[PDB]
Amino acid sequence: AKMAFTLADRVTEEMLADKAALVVEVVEENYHDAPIVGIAVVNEHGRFFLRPETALADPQFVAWLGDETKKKSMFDSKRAAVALKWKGIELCGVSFDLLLAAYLLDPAQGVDDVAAAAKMKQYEAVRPDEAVYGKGAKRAVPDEPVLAEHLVRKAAAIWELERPFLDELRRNEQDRLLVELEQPLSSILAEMEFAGVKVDTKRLEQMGKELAEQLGTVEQRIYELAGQEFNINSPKQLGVILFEKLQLPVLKKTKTGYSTSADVLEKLAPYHEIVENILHYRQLGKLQSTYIEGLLKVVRPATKKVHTIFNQALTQTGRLSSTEPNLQNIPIRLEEGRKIRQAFVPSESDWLIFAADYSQIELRVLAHIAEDDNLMEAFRRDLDIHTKTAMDIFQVSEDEVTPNMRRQAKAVNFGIVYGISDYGLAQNLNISRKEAAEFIERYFESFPGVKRYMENIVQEAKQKGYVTTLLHRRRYLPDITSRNFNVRSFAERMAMNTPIQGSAADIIKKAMIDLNARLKEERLQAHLLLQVHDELILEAPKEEMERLCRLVPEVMEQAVTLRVPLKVDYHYGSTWYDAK
DNA sequence: CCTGACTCC
DNA sequence: TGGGAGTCAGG
């Protein structure tokens, strides 16, 4: 705990070396248009702290930040990059991101500050951010000498930890996953977040006004049916109405009381008509609270854009997540909610939304990894995979598959990927459990390679302690040999599912990198707006639709080569709603 | 604050 | 007794 550093008043030349650890500190969790509170640089020549007002107005330092040949090691470079974009400054030459390095080494550690990464290599000459800034209403930037030391210690940590982290990644055969996939993707996500998505607020506000009316009507219908007013949004009060007043059967309990889950309420419809009304109300209520009000609260009013933050270092499987607002859970399944998408529009006149989605990428990945002959052959023929499973399960010709049979078979196909049990499948489909069990037993008899994969992958997890994806992402599963059935079983389902979900994540991430390259190469104005796990959303001048119709699916389908084809569907239109 | 509701993949 | 997420109101 004896670290010399220079608290500089102006920028000097020795601060602009062609390799440095750089800290551009943004303390607000949402870094969009957020203040930069301080800057640290550590390099061959020493350690430096700079005041943003100085350094970000210094044409020399700004030149250095944007010089691609001046290499920077950072932690969470996307945060710095975006915060600098809001200040009108370009950051290039980031060659190492410790956040992403830590994430690839072990997603379970939940590393979100430099101290937590440093802990992976027993480096303790740096403090947690929460310790320096405090939490909640106590959160605050400390006095300059304290801030400065903290920023410098974070930079010094990055400086000393780069080699050890790269050394383990390389030993794990994950170094390319970092340098050629995650770090390039970070820059692309930075572009997407900063560009944002334009919102039709007049349309959203009108929809909210009508929703309020409808909510009120449904609400009063519910009180009439219930014979009493209560808070419908309180599972506790609801549970009293349903299971005590109306004496409906109790199908499930949770740790706190009667369950009122959608699954449960659906099964109560043969008993009382009120449950259907209540489901409708809770649906409409979430629309109003989250997709009207919540969304309007985060729109930047002068530009009418919303700027999500894609968390790249959070999920245990390699997926992104999306926050403040979450733009990866915009309604689509019910027409009532789907119309929310009418409010998501192009950012320029005479532009259109272009949405491209992988068809059944998880099942194609399963087919590939399990190398199951019958499943691979179906995909090579582009036979409807749900129709095919229905034929095997029910043992019928293709022309005998009722839409109900296909409905059930779809539930089987997707459920196998999550390790569904017969209980779960019976409840999902609301069918006989004896029958549900027979569906699963017949599925594995028809796709024996999948059965072998599920057995082999759990054996692998037990022997190695972790499972891996196509592009060498890992997930450690230290509970896989627990003597406790629930704990062990959950870990076995993670072993089964993670190579599937995680490889699908790998593939779309690489597609984004390849797509951006192709877009720039061809000087197209089109650009990415969102990723939604197995979907990519873009906007572009209307003139460019013809090109994207060929280019986007092609790049997505060719991202990796599997033993089965990848297939991508696509649509475009005047709003996200219309891109279907 | 957690829990259980809704939303998405 | 179904894998991975985030936000919301109620309590």
CATH superfamily for A195-309 is Taq DNA Polymerase; Chain T, domain 4 (1.20.1060.10)
Is residue A357 a known part of a binding site? yes
What are the φ/ψ torsions at residue A328 (nearest 5 degrees)? -100, 5
Task: Please state, in angstroms and as integers, the Cα–Cα distance from residue A518 to each residue in A257, A358, A493, following that order.
Answer: 55, 19, 38
Instruction: Tell me how far apart the alpha carbons of residues A476 and A495 are, in angstroms, rounded to a whole number.
Output: 9
Residue located via tokens 């530009």 = A303
Decide yes or no: CATH 3.40.1650.10 for domain A361-504. Answer: no
Tokens representing A331 are 């309604």
Is the CB of residue A312 less than 8 Å from the CB of residue A78? Answer: yes
For residue A423, which amino acid is it? Y
Angle, CA of A45, A46 and A50, to the nearest 5°: 115
Q: Give kind and range of the element (H or E) at residue A166.
A: helix A144-171
Closest listed residue to residue A61, CA positions, set A71, A50, A73: A50
Q: Which long-range contacts (CB under 8 A, 24 or more apart) does A113-119 make?
A: A113/A75, A114/A75, A114/A154, A114/A157, A114/A158, A115/A157, A117/A75, A117/A157, A117/A161, A117/A165, A118/A157, A118/A161
Is the CB of residue A182 less than 8 Å from the CB of residue A314? Answer: no
> CA A312, A314, A318, A319: dihedral to nearest 10 degrees?
-70
CA A490 to chain centre: 21
Tokens representing A45 are 């020549």
Q: Which residues pair with A541 in a beta bridge?
A: A351
Angle, CA of A471, A474 and A477, to the nearest 5°: 150
Tokens representing A379 are 């995909």
CA A128 to chain centre: 25
Q: Which nucleotide is nearest to A491 (CA to C1')?
A: C3
Beta strand pairing status for A305-306 and A71-74?
unpaired
Closest listed residue to residue A176, CA positions, set A112, A70, A101: A101
Is the CB of residue A488 less than 8 Å from the CB of residue A477? Answer: no
Tokens representing A84 are 């600098």
Q: Respond yes or no on whether the N-terminal peptide bond of residue A35 is cis (omega within 30° of 0).
A: no
Kindly give, in sequence order, each residue whose CB lies less than 8 Å from that of residue A1, ignoring residues fewer than 6 positions away: A125
Beta strand pairing status for A46-50 and A38-43?
antiparallel
Q: Give kind and range of the element (H or E) at residue A19.
A: strand A19-25
Tokens representing A14 are 């020795």
Instruction: Tell me how far apart the alpha carbons of residues A458 and A491 are, in angstroms, rounded to a whole number.
Output: 9
Tokens representing A361 are 């990428």
> Which sign does the torsion angle of CA A200, A201, A204, A205 carry?
negative
Q: In what order do the strands lie in the sheet with A351-358?
A: A527-531, A535-541, A351-358, A568-573
What are the φ/ψ torsions at residue A156 (nearest 5 degrees)? -60, -35
Closest listed residue to residue A25, CA positions, set A14, A35, A38: A38
Is the CB of residue A412 less than 8 Å from the CB of residue A439? Answer: yes
Give domain limits for chain A: 1-194, 195-309, 310-360+505-579, 361-504
Residue closest to C11, CA→C1'? A234
Outline where DSSP puts E strands in A159-301: 197-199
Kindly give, in sequence order, each residue whose CB lies less than 8 Å from that of residue A388, ignoring residues fewer than 6 positions away: A378
CATH of domain A1-194: 3.30.420.10
Closest listed residue to residue A463, CA positions, set A445, A481, A451: A481
Task: Please state, in angstroms and as integers, the Cα–Cα distance from residue A228 to each residue in A259, A264, A285, A352, A456, following that order.
Answer: 20, 22, 19, 49, 56
Instruction: Tell me how far apart the alpha carbons of residues A417 and A237 are, in angstroms, rounded to a whole number.
Output: 36
Interatomic separation, CA of residue A279 and C1' of nucleotide B3, rounded (Å)? 18
Instruction: Tell me how far apart the alpha carbons of residues A110 and A114 are, in angstroms, rounded to a whole number.
Output: 12
Instruction: Tell me how far apart the alpha carbons of residues A197 and A346 are, in angstroms, rounded to a whole number.
Output: 7
For chain A, the farthest-separated pair of C-alpha atoms sits apart, in whole angstroms, at 80
Interatomic separation, CA of residue A450 and C1' of nucleotide B1, rounded (Å)? 43
Instruction: Tell me how far apart the alpha carbons of residues A336 and A342 are, in angstroms, rounded to a whole number.
Output: 11
Interatomic separation, CA of residue A359 and C1' of nucleotide C3, rounded (Å)? 18
What DSSP string runs through A68-136?
A: TTSEEEESSHHHHHHHHHHTT-----EEEEHHHHHHHH-GGG---SHHHHHHTTT--SS--HHHHH-SG
Give residues lining strand C (CB < 7 Å): A 231, 233-234, 236-237, 289-290, 293-294, 297, 311, 314-317, 319, 321-326, 328-329, 415, 418-425, 427-428, 486, 489-490, 493-494, 497-498, 501, 533
Report chain A's terminal Cα–Cα distance, integer Å: 59
CA A439 to chain centre: 32
Instruction: Tell me how far apart the alpha carbons of residues A202 and A139 are, in angstroms, rounded to a whole number.
Output: 36
Q: Give kind and range of the element (H or E) at residue A455.
A: helix A448-464
**Resolution of this deposited model, Å:** 1.7
CATH architecture of A310-360+505-579: 2-Layer Sandwich (3.30)
What are the φ/ψ torsions at residue A22 (nearest 5 degrees)? -130, 130
Please indicate the experimental technique that yielded this structure. Answer: X-ray
Instruction: Tell me how far apart the alpha carbons of residues A389 and A372 are, in angstroms, rounded to a whole number.
Output: 14
Interatomic separation, CA of residue A90 and C1' of nucleotide C4, rounded (Å)? 34
Question: Helix axis angle, A422-429 relative to A403-417, nearest 10°?
Answer: 140
> Which sign does the torsion angle of CA A403, A408, A409, A415 carry?
positive
Q: What is the CA radius of gyration of chain A?
A: 27
